[model samples]
Structures are given as structure tokens and as C-alpha cells.
Target: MILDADYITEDGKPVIRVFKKEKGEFKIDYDRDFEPYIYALLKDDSAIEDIKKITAERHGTTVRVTRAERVKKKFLGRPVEVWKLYFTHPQDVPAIRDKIREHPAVVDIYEYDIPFAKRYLIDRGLIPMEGDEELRMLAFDIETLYHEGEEFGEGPILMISYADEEGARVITWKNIDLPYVESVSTEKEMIKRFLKVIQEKDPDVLITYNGDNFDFAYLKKRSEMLGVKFILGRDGSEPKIQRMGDRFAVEVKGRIHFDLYPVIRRTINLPTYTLETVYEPVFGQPKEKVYAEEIARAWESGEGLERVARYSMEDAKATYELGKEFFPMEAQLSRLVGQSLWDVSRSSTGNLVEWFLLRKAYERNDVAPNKPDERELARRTESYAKEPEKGLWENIVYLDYKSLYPSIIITHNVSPDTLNREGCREYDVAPQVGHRFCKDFPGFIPSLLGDLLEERQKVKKKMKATVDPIERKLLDYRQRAIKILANSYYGYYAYANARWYCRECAESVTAWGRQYIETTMREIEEKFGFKVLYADTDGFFATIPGADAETVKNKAKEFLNYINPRLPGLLELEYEGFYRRGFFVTKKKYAVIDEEDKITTRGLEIVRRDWSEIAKETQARVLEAILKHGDVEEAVRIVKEVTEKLSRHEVPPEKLVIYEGPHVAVAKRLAARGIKIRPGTVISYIVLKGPGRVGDRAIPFDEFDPAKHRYDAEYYIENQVLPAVERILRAFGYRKEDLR
Candidate 1:
């Protein structure tokens, strides 16, 4: 129940007149009652017009605005006005934010409030749910007019379409009854109006297929063409465009933005990264029907333009549904949204805002924003950039714990509870084996964040069904954000820029991880009476010679089970894979035991899509042949035949090009330099034959370059022309004097 209360600010001004519930969640019905106050802060027609005027005058030299008008639309039987603000800006963010904030009653605000969600959950006593949470999300796709050249202005728009719970459809009515091609006048105008519509509807999250890198960038560029600033602010302040970065994000005040394409590319494991390829089987459809070619044809034909638009809308809806089902980020959103809501509900105490105020009241604290430290991040990135040399795999087979670092944070109670220096330094601190390092530090905020995350998981499960498409999307995004944030805190502590950067906390956590690794290794090898070969930050590498597949799998499970029980919170472990006959050719290569458990390179290919057809087929057969005594020689023989057939058909020599490493940039450079090597794809010659080694110590080069004098050049010659002839000469397990 909302209590009728008034808030008198420190300045003796009444800041909030409405009754704010002491501890209650926000509901749509309740929001309707408070709509007047909310609407009072919204961007009305006059305000939008003023923005355009100010932007136009401020950037008059570079910006050009042809049309600035307010459109009246009815929402829920009430008339609503939407003012489209379009203009260009010569200045960057600092100037834009200053200009926008200068407007009356504008503040730098966020649209998302996890505290609100958390309050509702708390009111209902559904604060902390365990296990993985599921959330549904909707994806949106908008196709605007793409005029040639770089004039960067809103073009006369043709159509508006949307897809979601309301179903797939298109809206092509011209503004003020303008024609299809000439309606928009400039891209800036369309985007200004588009963003205005989005702000008004206030979806929990906004998802675009590739909005971060493509759509928003295009829109921002065009917005700058006109004199009016096309900045999207939640409360009409603080330009949203400035905060846009890689992946899906929402910058409008009070809203979350999600980019489906990037999220899928980063988080979801897929054989291919194309939307159509990933979504077809999962969502039961393909996006080919709405191909650009078809849209263009329909536009020209004038017959099925509506159909084309409908198809396009469906594409947007497909992304939404597919994202919800396949890449639900329920765990992350629940925590973020819940925490935001909790802040508002618990405004009197314990909320982030209240906490911040309390902290600041005591002292001027310059807390860095919670993110990874740049230097440590750079170091980690450099480490990842260079491939480590593969040492002998005396103990192979890596069992990686999924989302390991995040799980560690959850399990160890290594939160602000352990780090924050509240007044309770003298409280009876229990001896926690996992949390032995930081028993003395102050840990209130991180502890709260951890609690918020735990609570969010519960809310996610509760709202899975009742949530609107938009809410579901936002929820999932928030959950994923929480996980990423939690894991990133460690990196942030090590870095100076992290808001949560506490060097003591960072060092403590690192020490904890190192200890965990050492302890686990010792236990596995000594206590459990098992020979553990190798161990890393979150995985164990073990080799059990003469052990059956079941024995290996069981041993892995036993290890997780034994270790997990020792932690404070809920922790789980599951086996990812077990190889019957596996070999680690290189550190990065993943080869495991086949059914027959033979030492062979028969069943594995580089996990690359561009591998040669022969290489791919050989890799598949190599795995299959080892598992089952199939004709491995026949597989090689067929590759040779295919190579001959391909050669006979006069396949373009350009097709023989392939890249050799994991470096995408190097591949492009090699392509430019006339080396027709593709990464992952072996040349046809090697596909048909076996690899030859140079007498016990070296490998012969078929094609030698005088400059580099490296045998790597032989890749182009032997793989393209010689077939298995060189390999056959080297099959004696010795070097051929002539070839050497």
C-alpha cells in the first residue's frame, strides 16, 4: 500500500508530493494512478519543439532541419502527442549533454530501475530463488530508407513496422499524408520520431538485430545532419547516443537496450553466427522470405509492398522470439532489475541511493564505476592475443567449469559482507575456509549486490510467464549484466577505473582463487588417491590411462560433488565431456578418446568454418573411424579422388586460398598478399594423403620462399598441386634424403 507522505528536501522544498509506498512494488495499475506525475516529467510537444529550436540555433551552421512537427496519436483512448526533434551537432557529448541538461527540469536519469522489481519481489516474499532462471525477450528490426552517398540526413521515409506479442505487421501511413518515397525528407527526422515513439511506449528493453554497430550508428550520423540534436534522453536530459557502445544497450532514461546479434555472437555457442542459420531450427523459420531483394522487387512492382513490409516485421519478431527462447539471460536481468526496484522501495535505508548518500555524507568518496580495470584487462587481452606454446600433454583432457569466475563469487561469500568496513568489524567472524582471506575488510555494497543477484534469480522464475515480451527481454538482459558485472568486479578491483575497485578486495579474491586451485589439485591427487595431471583457474586436466569412459566420467563427477559440498552457498558441477581416445596435438587443439581409444589424428578438424571440404570430411571421419572401425583409409582415398575431380574441373586457383591461424586479421592480410590459404580448411593434396615428417627432427618444405626461408610456404605448393606424393615418400617414419 502506498503511504500518503510528503518529502521535504534539505532545501525545505517539497520534492515529492505523492505518497510513496514504504516498501511496495510498482504495478502497471498503480503506475496509471501516478501517470500524471510521470507525464508531467515527460517530453511534451512544447518541450520537444524547444529542443529542436535550441539545437537548431546552437548548431545552425552545420545542422539543417526541413520539417519539425508534432503528431497527435491516441493511446488507450487518450490523445497523446509525439514531437519529432531532428538536428545535427558539430560538438560532441560534453556539449550535447550540457545543452540538453540546460533545458528546464532535465536530469541525467536511467530508464531501468532494478530496485522497483526487487521491491515487488520483496513485498511478495519471493526475494531469492535458486538455480537458472528463464526469461523471454522480443527483438525489433526497423528498415529505414538508405539513400546513397554520405549526406547523413533523414530521407523521406517509406514504412514503419513492428513485431512482438501484438503479432507481425507493418504501418505505412505517411505522416500528414505524405507519399511513400518523399514522406520522411531526412533520416534524422525519421529517427527522431522513431525514438520518440519508443520512449513513449517505454518497453523494458529494446532489441535490434545489429543496432549497436549498424542501426543506431546510422541514425546518429543522420541525426547530426540536421541542426536539431536527435539525442534520446529518458527525462529529456543527458544524450543517450553518447553512451552507445558495442552490443545491445538502451540509454534512454528508464529503459534497457539489447542488441540480439552481438549477444548471440558473444554468449551463445553456435556452429554458424548468422541470424537465419541460428534461428531457423530454434524458431522454426528462416528470414529469407523478407530478403532485401524481395523488398526492392515489391517496392518496384507496387503490388506486394505490404507483404514485403509484413515479412520485414516478422524478421524483427523472429529475432525477439528466438532471443527469448534460445538466449534467455534470465539470471542477469533478475538481479539488476530486482536491485533497482529494491533501491526505490527501500529508499529510507539499504537502497543503493540511500547507501550512496550515507557513504557520501560521511566523506567525499570517489568510487569508480563498477567495471574491469583497463590495465589488467589489457594484460589479459594481450595474453589471449598470443598463443601459448603447446607443452607435452602428460595429463590431458580439460574439464572446464562453465561461467567459473561468476560461480566462485557466488559460492565463496567473498562479497562486501567480507570486504566493506561497516561498524561491525568486531562481530564474531566465523572461520570460512573459502573466505578466510577477507574476514576483516568492510563489504556492505558488494554483499548487497550479491544478495540482489541471488534475489533476482527468484524473480526471474516468478515472472517468466506473466511478463510482457518487452519486460522479459529486459529481465534477461539485466540478469546477464549482473553475472558479467560480478565476474568483472575482480578485474575492476585490480584496475584503477573500476567503481568497485578496492585493491585489498581484489588481492584477497585473487589469493582465494589461487588457493582454491592449489587445494583442489592437492585433494584430487593426494586425498582422493587420483593422479591429477594438470589444473588451471577453473578446470582440471586429468589422464587416466587404462580407465574406461564411465570411470573417467564418474571420477569427474565425484570430484565436483566432493568439492562443491565444502562451499558456503549453492554450488554445482556437471561433466562437459569425456574422450575415450583423445590427443592434444597443440594446446588449443581438442581431441579426445574415440570408442576404440586409439592414438590417432583420425577424428578431429580445426573448429573453423572455412576448412576445406576434404579437411572437414576427413576430420569427421577421423573421429568416426577411431570410435568405430570404419574405413579410415577409404576416407583419405575419397579425398584424393575429390581433389582430382576438383582439379579436373579447373576450379579457380583463387579457391585454393586459406588462412592458417586463429587470427582473422592475418587471414585478411594473407588473402591480400596472394596466399590462397584458408584457416581450418586443409589443401586438397593433404586431404587425400597423410602428413609427412622430415626425418626424426624436421618437416620438408615443398614450396620455399627465398626471403623467409620457412617451410610454411610449402603449404601453397604441396597442398595445391602435389596431392599426397610428398606425404607418401615420408610415410616410412624417416626422412627422404632427396626431399630434405
Candidate 2:
């Protein structure tokens, strides 16, 4: 079974490699037979001659057009003949793409922009790790001695720790020695030993936390400065930096560089993406806090550098475990989407959905639509919220549609091809959008969605019934990805750059969405005799129909059964939960304490990141005081006490640091003061007392001098603390000044 796929060029031709594991060992499967190809949509046979001429006449020395023939494929759900253009080199497809595409005869192109490695996988139907195979994985991290007059990534790496089958080991240049530690004389010697170990150990996958952004990048730079080779690839080739949207990745030639930071960031929703925050939730072990300054001090302590070593080892193990947690899903997703694991780990949901469709389309010889341009895009493509009753409330039951838009899609046969159908007697018309779909047969997207959802159910059952924990986990991850991809199909149509983008399909989906929400609200009030509290696109809250918890839940079940049959195909209403007590600040802003007394909040200050941590903590306590204890006085007391601390300048600078939403000039001034800002850098600034704009007054928290500079107490009290707490308080007849 293949683990990953990559290609390297030799003799001016590509050697496509599929890394495989067989019988507990790994080897490479090379295919030199495959040639790089792109498709051409010809208006007529006359156009093909010009396209052929354009390709054959361009750059025949190093690269040349090798083959051209008419191929059978379907475009827009119809059979159309297109020319298959093949080249000697994979990189040559784009070399002549501009000239060929400019021809009037060649209308459009398909499969030109896809990475050649991904193209190989999709074309061969070679799924990675379909059956069980032992995978050799290693995880590593580095600790740097952070100092002044230097930027991040420029600091010398003090220690490097790695964890593998033999457990953890640390290599440091400093004079520190222990069972797990190996001391070296200088940074160059340390790196040489590290590289030697990596080559000797030879793991199939190297895992790290932000390895692409930090570890690998730092190693590459430091090695360059010290004149050492940084190649960790199995084939002895150096690493390459691949641009992945706003971030970047360091791709080793033959190894799967599994960076867990991007994996967890996209998979999990959290207040912060710190390794500690992510680790604690998964491993149930609280992280040991050690700052950069602490690590620097420990490095100076010489033998005390052991503490930093331990931290590095912990991070290495955590990364390995985190990678183990998500790799199965990434592999499953990679296979399902017909892309490499490297690309799958970084791709967006919209891209994944489109890729899945692209593979299915390939199987059927269905040509992919061109990614929309501004002219082509002009032809293509709400959830209503209810204001909540103010103050405290009780006995609320939540009901929501199970995969609302997708369900509606499957039921009505709403699809790009089936949409606005002609000469179909049996059809379903959308509520508000003037769109109709044929009941004659399921449309392409709908049928695809149906299959994805069906396979997910099968996997879900397998996950539950299987006894092996590892097998169960793989199955669980498989089912989860299927569900995620299925949910994203509706949004795919709304995505502007999507190949299969259809604005009418997207509009119709929401039209049905609004119809269901409003209809459900009316039914709950009139039929069930429940007071409807609030509603959004696919879900709503109603007064629980009961004298106690038992009766309340039973009535919710009774309502569920009654509504499921009345609904359209596959659109089943589910009970989210029953909240014993909840309070609403406004539409989409509310908090609830369930019967088990678990608190859930939405669209409030505490749920946001722009506000200071102090503000977030303040709102959380206020909500707890009001909702949990029903004590408005305690809520008032909490806010007043927090305000007093801000006024007295007793609050820590850590809590005062605002992540974003500060003026650009503050960042400019920061750069002027030699504090370089980069993307994803947590900009930490405090509002200080000065004469200019807030930007002028704002200084980097580290640059602030307590003796000479003082924070704006009124800024925190009035702007941060008051605005955060005022929303909930105002709903209780208290103004912003009341808390002040």
C-alpha cells in the first residue's frame, strides 16, 4: 500500500514515485510510463489543427509535445470529444498553456493546474494505506535561545529533542549531560549529530508542531549559516518550501512531513492554537508553562538547561501523539480526495469537496468545468435569527435539521444539471427561487451527496461494532471526513472560484432553508402548543412541554417522530438538547445551562478573540453569576471589582495585550522601534498614556516602562471591560455606565 506520492526529475524527464509499505517495510514504486497531459475543449476540428501547431512549435529542445489524440469525456453532463495533449516533461504543460489557451478553437482546458504527483494518484486509482501497514513515525522539536537585537528564527537553537520507537532523546550544544541528553561542543556539531541520527533512524514520517513555520525553517536557515547540509530526506535530496495559502510548508523529498499545528487548527475549534491548549484537551494532562525568556535563562544556567530539554521532549511526544491522532484521517481524506497527504493536510473544505467531485467526474469521464474568471463568474450565484426574550429563562428544547441543506438537496434532486429543468412533468419547485428540479432521476451532485452520506453511515456502524481500538479509530475518522465533505457540498456552489459553481443551486438551497425554518416555527407554536423562543436557518428553540425533565424529553421525542414523516426525503429534525435555564442578550447572542449544568454560549464577547483576555474573563464570570446563580448583584459586583483593578493598574500586562484590531500605525511605530511584525504573529500592545491617536499611544508591551509609561486605565475600563459586560447587563435594564 502506498503511504505518500512524490516525483523527481532526472535526465529532463519525471520519475513519479509512490512510497509504499509492504510486509512491515517500505519501498518506492516508480512509474516512468506516465507522461504529463492536459485536456483541450475544441470548438471544431479546425481549432485542433491550430492547437496542435501551437504546442508542437514551442520549445522543442528540452521539452516537446509528445502525443495528441481525441479522447472520450463528458462535459456539463454531456458527451463531448476533447483533445488529450501530452508532454515530455510535467512542468512543460504550463510553459505553453498561455499560448494554446489564447487560440479561439481551444475553448478551455482541464486538469492543467493539478500537481503532477496528485495527477499520478488520481489516474492510477492507487489508494494510500488502504490495508493496514506498519508506519515508522518520528516527532521532533527545537528550543532556541531567544535574545535581544535579533528576530525570531534568527536565534541559535539551544537544544533539539526527538521521540520515536525508542522513546525520547535530546541533543544540545550546551554543557548539559544526562541519560536522555547528548552534549556537543557547538551548534554545528549539534546539527551534524541531529542530521546523522535522522538519517540513521530513517522514519517514514517526521512530525512536529509548526515544523514548516518554525522547526524545519529554523533548521534550514541555521544549517545554511553554519555551512551544514540540512537534508533529512530518505533519498538524500534537500527539502523544498511549498507555499500553502497564507502559511508555508517545508516538504522533504521523500518523507511525509506531518505538521500537526495545521491539522489541529483546521480540525478543532479553540480560543487559541497553542500547543498546550490543544494538548491538554486531547491528552487530559495540563501543559507545563515555560516562556521564551525562561528557556533563555535556563540555557544560561548550563546544567539547568535540562529543564528546556524536558520541555522539548514533551513537545516532541505531544506532536507525535497528535499526529497519530490525525494521520489516519488525513490519509483517509487523501485517498478519498485523490490527492497527496501533503496537499490534503493543508487544503480547505471547499477544495476538498471539489476534489472529491473531480475524482468521481474522472471515473465517469466527466470533464471538469474551468475555474471561473471574472467574465465567466458573472453568470453564477440567509439564516434568519430571532430576538430572544430578555433576562433569565427556563424549560427550553432545541430542535434542528440533520444536515439541512444537503438533506434538502438529496430530497428535492436540486442540482446544477437538474436545476431549471425543461419538459419534466414530475418536478419539485423551490419556494422562492424560480428554480425546478426533475424527479425523473437524481442529479449528479445529489446522487454523489447521497452516496457520500450512505457510505458515512456504513462506516459509522463499523466504527461502533469493531472491537479493536485502532480499527475503530480509523473507521471513526473516515466517517467524520465523509460527513464533513458532505456538509460542504452546498457551500461549494457558493464558492466563487469553484469549477462546478452554480449560483442558482446555492440560492435554491437557502430558499428551502428559510421555508423549513419558518414552517417549523409555526408548527411548534400551533401544533405542539409550545412557545417558540428563537430560530435560525435550520434550528430553533421552543418551550419544553413537560412538568419535569422526564416528561420534557419525552415530549421532544414525540415531536420528533411527528415531524420526521411530514418532512421531505431525508430531512429529519433532531433534538439538539434541553436546556433547563438560558438567558438571551440578543439575536444569536445567548447562553444556556443544561440540565447537567454545563454552560454553552454563542456570539458573545467571551466567545470572541478581538477583546482582551481580561474582558473575555470578565464577561464569562458575569454570565456565570447571572445564569448559573441567577444573581444580578453578584454579576454587578464582579464587573465593578474587575473595573477597580484596571483603574488601579493592578491587572497584568499579559491580560491587557490585545491580539488584533489595533491601528496599523501602532504596528508601523513598532517596526520603527525594531519590532518586526509578520503574519500570524500575536501583536501584543498596551494602550499607554500619550498625546496622539490610540495607535500613537499603543506600545509593545515589552517596550512599556512602568516607571515612565503608564497604561490607560480608562481605556480598559470603558472600552474593553464595559463593552464586554454591558451587552448582558443592558438586557437587564443596566447601562454601560452602571458597571463603570
Candidate 3:
């Protein structure tokens, strides 16, 4: 299995330096055989309107135009032939690429922007980590001691901790009596030890929480200042923070650096994204709480050094746990896309789809389309979405289009390849957009999407039948990758950077989505006499009159039966589930109680930064009380109890901070004191009675003295607690008077 791949110039010839892993073995394989190339469409143009003198020549540069072949690669499923231009040196393509573009024979170009390593993998049909070999990933974190007046990247690193599958280790400058601890006297020696670990362990992947911007960035600066070699790469190369468009990536030459923080941010949605906060929910145990401020003190004293060491160790340990949790899906996605894991881990869902398509294009000899320029990209817009109707309903059944947009593409055969031309035997015309898709043959995207969708179903069935944990997990990950790719195809066609971007086809998918969902809603309502309550883009909610859960469910099934057969190919109307009680407020926001007695909320997730913990908790308790038992009194009681406790100053300052007062004031205060408060820092503040806005009156915990200052009761009860639950209580028919 190839863990990593990149090119190096050896004796004036570029050879791909690839890190390979096998069962209990690892090696770097250097391949000097392959040559870099580009596919260019050559066209002859010397026309006199009617009578024309035409001549064309195809050229491939092996050193300089070594050979030419009659190769027919499909361009949008059209049998278009392109000059497969092979280059001797990697740079030679770009050196003469602009000249080739204006050569009078060449009309267009492809595969110019792709990196050497990426193009190498795609051209050769090689997918990374295909073999059944587990990757050696080391999760690491560096703890820094704040000098009180210095900004981040200026602070001294106290310790660097590492954790992998086998064990946890912490290398510190301070003497610490622990099995995993390695004490070094100087900061330079500690840095050397850290670098040595990577070199000795020879891990395939380096894992971190937010290492790119923080940990790795910090280490890079420290290593520069200390004049120590930060050589973590297999080729003794220095890891660099390279800029790609808007963001920066820390690229380790021969190892896949899996930054779990960004990956989690993309996949998982949560109120707090701290290591402990993230870890607690997944593993049922939080890492021990060690404050950032306390870390400096801890590193200073013998007793505190142990705490700092353990805290640093746990940071890496927790990161390791998260990396392990997310790696399977990532690895499978990397394999599916035929890209390196380092690139795949950082790419968006849209990018993943494009990578997959590019690989498929390579296989099918389909010339990958050029990315849109600034003007064309600016012209591109997103797919459509409609707002849902707001109302409360009991025994409401939700009918949803099965993978709506994906099915739209497949069923309609909507793709750039199937876009409208002069003549067609049949057409799938989209409503509103008026985009026409040819129905005679399978499209490039639709055909590929269908297979991907089909593959997911097969994997799911096999996954359900298997009992072996490892086999089950593999299949589970495989299905997840397929699902993500299949669902993401619709957006890819609309995305500006996409190789197969088709504005007409992308818009048509949504138009057809709106058509199918509305069709189902109309049929279910008129034929079955069900009251349609909420109808959105791809799903809708309806009421069954005086029916109970069983009646609603049966009618939903009947609705599906009537609509499914009438719908187009692969466009299914599935009965999502029956809700006991659904509380829908205005547009988008809704809360539903399901059969499992769990409250599932959309747009109702309490944001910790937006609302005070007191307000959020009160709102949550109030909503649950009404939904679970229809008891407004209990909800009112809960709110009043919080008020009474708050009036007596029993409410903690930590729970009293709101949107502006909490994070804003504290963040400013931290910065003022030269403490670089990173992301997910839980800032605590309380509203102190004074002048100006509440945020202005609010004081940071670091500056506040509880004995002298007082928390404003009116702000807590009137502004925070009441405002949060007032809307819900009002919806439940409770008066303003009753709420207070």
C-alpha cells in the first residue's frame, strides 16, 4: 500500500518518491520510469467561410514531440481525440504549455493545474492504501508556556506529547518521573527528541487536533528560533505550511498529516469543539480538565509539572482516539477518490466528487473539462431550496424523496454529457429552469452516479449480514464513502471548480427535485385526504386527522405505494418516519418527538456562544417539558425556579454569560493580556451593573472579584432566561404574564 507519493529530481531526471507499507514492513519506493504528460485537444483552423484550407498536427513531447498516436478520448461522451502530450521533464509541460495553447493547431488544454503526484496516481490508475495494511498514525500535541506579555508563536513550548495505538509518550524539558516521560535539559534538545521520534517511529501518518495553524505552526517557529532541524519528513525535508488558495496546509513530505480538528469540523456538528468536549461524547469519558492559564504554573513547579505532563499526554491521547474514530471513513474515501489521504482529508465533499470523476475520466479516456475562469465561475450559482411551512401537528408523517438530488440526476439522466443538443430521440426537460437532458443514452455523471448508488446498496446489505467487527466496520466505512460521494454529485455539477460543472444539469436536478416532492405532496393530500402541514424542497410533513401513530404509519405506507410506482426511474418517495408530536415554529426551525421518545431538533440546537447556559438550559427544559408531556406548568416552574435562584445570586458567573458578554469580552481581555485564545475557548463573564451595553458592563473572570462586584438579576431573568423561553411558552398558549 502506498502511504505517500511525491516527485524528486534525481540526476536531472524526476523520480517519484513513494512511501510504501506492507504487512509488518515499510519502505520508500523510488520509481524513475514514468514520464509526466498532459492531454491537449489539437484543432486546425484556416477557414474562408465556405472553401477552407485545413491541416492539423498532434504532438506529444517526450523530450520534444517524440510520438503521436490516434487516441479517441471522449469529451462529454463525444468521441473527441486529443494529443496525449508526454513530457520528458515535469517543468517542460508548463515551459511550452502557453506556446502550445496558441500553436494554431491546439484548441484547448487539460490536466495542467494538477500536481505531479496527483496526476501520477490518476494516470497510472493507482489508489493509495488499497492493500489491507493498517497505517501507523501518531497523534501529537505541544504545550506552550505563556510569558504573559508575548503573543502566540512567541511563547516557549513546555512539552510535546505523542500517542499512537501502542502507548502514550511525553517529551519535556523539565524532569518528570513517569514511564512515558523523556526529560531533556534544553529546549533545542527537546525539539531534537521530538523530531527523533518521528524519524525512529517512521509512522505513515501524523495526527493532530488543530496542528496546522497552532501546534505545527508553533513548532516550526520555535525550531527556526532555536536553529534546530525540524526534519520530520522521510527525505530529511522540512515540513512546510504551504498556502493553497485561501487556507494554509502543513505538508509533511512523506507522511499523511491528518489534522482531526478540521476533519471533525467538516463531518461533525457540535456546540463546543474542544478536545475534551469532542472526546467526552464519543468515548463517554472526558480528558482531565487542565486550564491553559494553569499550564504555565504547572510547568514551573514539580507538582504542577506532573499535571502539565499528564494534560499534554491526554491531549495527544484524546486526539489519537478522535483520529481512530474518523480514519476509516477518510481512508475509504481516499481509496474511492484515488487521491492521497492527506489531500482527501482536507478536501470538501464537492472536491471528493470531482477527484472521483477525474479518476473515472482517466479510466474511461474522458478528457477532464477545464475549470471555469473568474467570469464563468462568477456566473455559477447554487442549487435551489424552499422554506417549510410553520405549524404544530400531532401524529405527523414525513415523506421524503430518497436521496432526492442524486436520484434526480440518475432518473432524468442529467449530466453535462447528456445536455441538450440539436436533435434527440427523447428529452427530460426540467420545470422552471427549462433545461433539457437527452434520455437516449446514459450520461457521464448519471451513469457513474448510478453505479455508485448501486454499490452503496450492495455494501449496506453485506454490512447488515456480517457479524465480524473488522469486516463490519470496513463495509460500514465503504458504504459511508459511497453515500457521501453519491449525494455530493448534484452539487459538484454546479460547483465552479468542478471538471464536469454543468449549470443547466445542476439547476435541472433541483427543479426536478421540487417537481417530484410537490407531486408526492399533492397526491398524498388529494388521494388520501391527509392534511399537508409542511412542504419543503425534498421532504414534507402531513397530518392524519384523528389518526394515532399506527394509522398515520399505515397511511404513510399507502402514500408511498401510490407515489413510488408513478415516480420516474430511481426517484423514490420514502416514508421517513411518523412523529408523535411536531412543534414547528416559523420557517426552518422544528422539534419532533419520535417513537424512541427522543426529541430531534432542527434549527433548534442551542448554541452555547449565542445564548447563556442558563437561558439555553431553560429553553431546552421548557421545550422538552411541553413536547414530552404537554405540561406548560412544569416548564413555567422550571423557568421560575431558575429566576428565583438567579435573584439570590446562586447562578454562577460561568452560566450567566451571553452572546456578547461571554466570549467577546473574555476574548478581548485575553488578547489585551497577550494570551492568544484559540478557537473553542470557553470564555466566562458576568454582567456587572454599570452603564453602556450589557457587554460593556460585563467583566472577564480573570479580572472579576465575586465578593465586590454583583451580577445583575434583571439582566439574568428578564434578558437571558425569559427571552429564551418566552417564544416557546407563547406557542404553547401561555400568556406573557404567565411566563414571568
Say which candidate scores most in lDDT: 2
Residue-wise C-alpha lDDT for candidate 3, range 41-119, written one tens digit per residue: 6564221111111223234423354344446777876787666666666776666666566656667777887788887
lDDT of 2: 0.78
Best-fitting candidate, measured by TM-score? 3
Model 3 poorest 10 in a row by lDDT: 46-55
TM-score of each predicted structure versus truth? 0.50, 0.85, 0.87
What's the lDDT for candidate 3? Answer: 0.76
Query: Which residue ranges in model 2 land beyond 4 Å of their true spot?
Result: 46-51, 56-65, 150-156, 285-306, 374-385, 544-549, 605-625, 629-724, 737-740
Candidate 3 Cα RMSD (Å):
4.8
Clashing pairs in 2: 381-503
Better of 1 and 2 by TM-score: 2
lDDT per residue for candidate 1 within 1-740, as digits (tens), equals: 22122122332112322222222221221221111000112344456545544432333333333245554443212244443332222122223434554677443211112122222333333322122422223455556554434355455335545555655544443323212222354445655566665555545445567665556555555456554565453335433443333333334343344556644664567766666667775656566531333335434654445445545666676767765553344323333333332122212211223323223322322221223446755553332111222222222445665555444554554543354334434432223332342434334444544665676587578558655776676655665555554455555435443334345555555565666666666776675556554444676556555566566667767777787687444434445555443323333433345344544442133445434444344445544543344333543454455445464533343334343222433334334644433332322221111145321112112232334332222342334323322232223222323321
Tens digits of lDDT, candidate 2, 1-740: 67778887887889988887688676888888888899888788776655666643334564455778989876665578888988887778877887777877777788888888877777887776577767789998888765556675577887888998688888887766567888888989999999899888788788888888878778888888899988777777788887877878888766788888877988888877788889888867875653443434553665455566677778878877878888887888877787768778988899999878878887877788878777776655322116766667677888878889898888888877787667878998888877888888768898888888889898888888999988887787788878778889888888878888887788888898888878877776788777777777778777754467676677778888988888877888888888877777766887888878788887765555657878888888988887778888899988888889888989886788885635565677667854455454556677886676544567667776768878888888876778887777877888877776
Give RMSD to native, each candidate. Answer: 15.7, 5.2, 4.8
